[PDB]
Copies of this chain bind each other. A is one copy, B any other.
Amino acid sequence: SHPGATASDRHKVVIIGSGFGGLTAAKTLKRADVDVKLIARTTHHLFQPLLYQVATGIISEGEIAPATRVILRKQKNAQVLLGDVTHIDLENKTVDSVLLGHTYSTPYDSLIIAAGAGQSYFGNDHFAEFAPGMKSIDDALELRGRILGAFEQAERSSDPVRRAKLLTFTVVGAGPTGVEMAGQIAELADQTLRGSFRHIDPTEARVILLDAAPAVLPPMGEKLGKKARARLEKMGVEVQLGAMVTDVDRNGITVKDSDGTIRRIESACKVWSAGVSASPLGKDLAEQSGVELDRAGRVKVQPDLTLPGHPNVFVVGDMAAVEGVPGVAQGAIQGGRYAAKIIKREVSGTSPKIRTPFEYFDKGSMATVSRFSAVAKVGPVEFAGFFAWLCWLVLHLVYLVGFKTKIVTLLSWGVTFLSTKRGQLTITEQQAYARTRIEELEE
C-alpha cells in the first residue's frame, strides 16, 4: 500500500542493497534524468575487505561503515531508504520491504539488484548457532567478543582441559577471509596479549585452519598458495587440508578427512568462513522469470545482466552468476557501473538497437596473510611478501571514505604493526551473545 518514498514523475530507478554495486550505480546516476530509490538493510556501506580488522580490534566501526546518507548527501536525485526487502514483483513493478513491522511497496521502472551473498554451511544450517561467519558489523563484533572472551574465561579455570578447549581457535575455510582470520587471531594471541595474562601464556594458544579444499587460496594457484601456507605454518597456524566438517557444537568440531579417519577437535571458538550463498531474492526471481540459479543460488543473468523476459531489471555483483567473473569488489563495481550506464543511455534516448555485452575488466586480486606478508597476482605477474603487503594496504587505504578516516586508519596501522598494541579491544557480553541467546529464546 504505502509507497514508502517520495513521489515521482520521471523514470523511477529502485536499487536494492547499498554495498559496492548498488552504491556505484547510485553514484553513476548522479546527473542522469532519473529518480533513484536505494533500499538497503543497513545505513552503512560496509567496506567488507577490512572487516577482519574490526573483527580483531585493529580499527573501529566508523572507519569501515560510513553512513550512506552522508555519501549520497549532495545527490539530489537519490533518496536513501532503510528497509529489508521482503518480496519483489516483476509484473506489478513493486519492491516490498519492511521496517520495524511497517510494510512499504515502492514502485519501480527499473531495478538494480545488488543483494550480494554470504557464507554457506552446505545445509548443516544449524551450525550457525555455534560458528558465525562475520560478513556484517554485528557478526564481526560478535567474533571480537568471543575471541577475547575465550582468554578471559581461560584465566579463571583450574581445569587444564577446559583451558586447552578455550585456547584453541578453529577457522573453517581456507578462502581469503579464513587466512585473514587465522592470521590475525594468531598475531593477537602471539603478540598483543603477550604480557597481559598471568595464569596462562597466550602464546600457547592454538589456531587451526580447516578446509576440505586441497589447497589454500584455490583461485591464486599452487605457488602463491604454497607460499601463503608456509607463512601461516611459520607463524605456527596448524593448516589442515582435505578435512570436511561432519558436526559442530559448542564444545568442538568433528572432521572427516580423505582417509575417513573421523576425529574430533575440542575448540570453544569457531569461525565459519567457508562457502557462498546468494541472497534468497534469487528464489523469487527464479519463480517469476524462470531464470536458472546455480548452486549457491546465484542468478544466471543474461549477457546484459538482465533477467530473461524482464529487461531493465538488472542483477549485479555477487548475486549474479556471470560466467568466469570472480566474486570480488571490482566485479560488483563494474556490474553496477555497467547497469547504470545502460539506464542513463536509454533514458537519454541514445540507446543502441542492441546493448553490448558486459565485459569484466580483470584488475587483479590480493590477499593478506599477516603483518608484512601478503600475496598478489596481476595477469602474468605474481609477487608475495612485504612489497605485496604494502601494495594491499595502499590499495584499500585509497578506497576508505573521507580523508580523516584514512588518517586515523593509517595511525591505527602505524601503532598496531610497529607496536604490540591494538585499539578497539573492548568486549561487551551483549554483543558477544545476543544473537545466539535470542535465537535460543525465540521459541
Q: How far is the CA of A26 from the CA of B433 in the complex (A)?
A: 30
Tell me whether B62 and A423 are in contact (CB under 8 A): yes
Min CB gap A147→B, angstroms: 12
Shortest C-beta distance, A197 to chain B (Å), equals 7
Any B CB within 8 A of the CB of A302: no
The answer on a CB contact under 8 Å between B104 and A156 is yes
Query: Which residues in chain A, 171-216, are within 8 Å of chain B measured between CB atoms?
Result: 193, 195-199
Decide: A152 near B43, CB < 8 A? Known: A60-B424, A138-B428.
Answer: yes
Q: Which of chain B's residues has its CB closest to A78's CB? A: B198
Partner of A434, one of B70, B79, B193, B430: B430
Most interface-central of A2, A67, A136, A152 (chain B CB within 10 A): A67
Count the copies: 2
Say whether, besides A60-B62, A157-B102, A70 and B411 are in contact (CB < 8 Å): no
A421, CB-defined interface residue at 8 Å:
yes
Between A65, A74, A79, A196, the greatest number of chain B beta carbons within 10 A of the residue's beta carbon is seen for A196
Chain B positions within 8 Å of A437 at CB level:
438
Q: Which of A199-248 contact B (CB under 8 A)?
A: 199
Say whether B426 contacts A5, CB under 8 Å. no
Interface members, chain A 69-117 (any B CB < 8 Å)? 69-70, 73-74, 79, 81-83, 99-100, 102, 104
* Interface hit among A304-312, A391-399, A400-408: A400-408
Q: What residues of B have a CB within 8 angstroms of the CB of A415 in the complex?
A: 404
A155 within 8 A of B: yes
Is A137 in contact with B428, judged by CB distance below 8 angstroms?
A: yes
Quick check: B138 and A81 within 8 Å, CB to CB?
A: no
A292 interface residue per 8 A CB criterion = no
Given contact pairs A60-B62, A69-B196, A437-B438, A43 touches B427 in the complex (Cβ within 8 A): yes
Which A residues have a C-beta under 8 Å from some C-beta of B?
2-6, 42-44, 57, 60-63, 65-67, 69-70, 73-74, 79, 81-83, 99-100, 102, 104, 136-138, 148-149, 152-153, 155-158, 193, 195-199, 402, 404-405, 407-408, 411-412, 415, 421, 423-431, 434-435, 437-438, 441-442
Q: A60-B60, A79-B155 are in contact. List 18 more A-B contacts (CB 8 A).
A: A3-B158, A6-B199, A57-B62, A62-B426, A65-B426, A69-B193, A70-B196, A73-B196, A82-B152, A99-B156, A100-B153, A136-B428, A137-B426, A138-B430, A402-B421, A430-B434, A434-B435, A438-B441
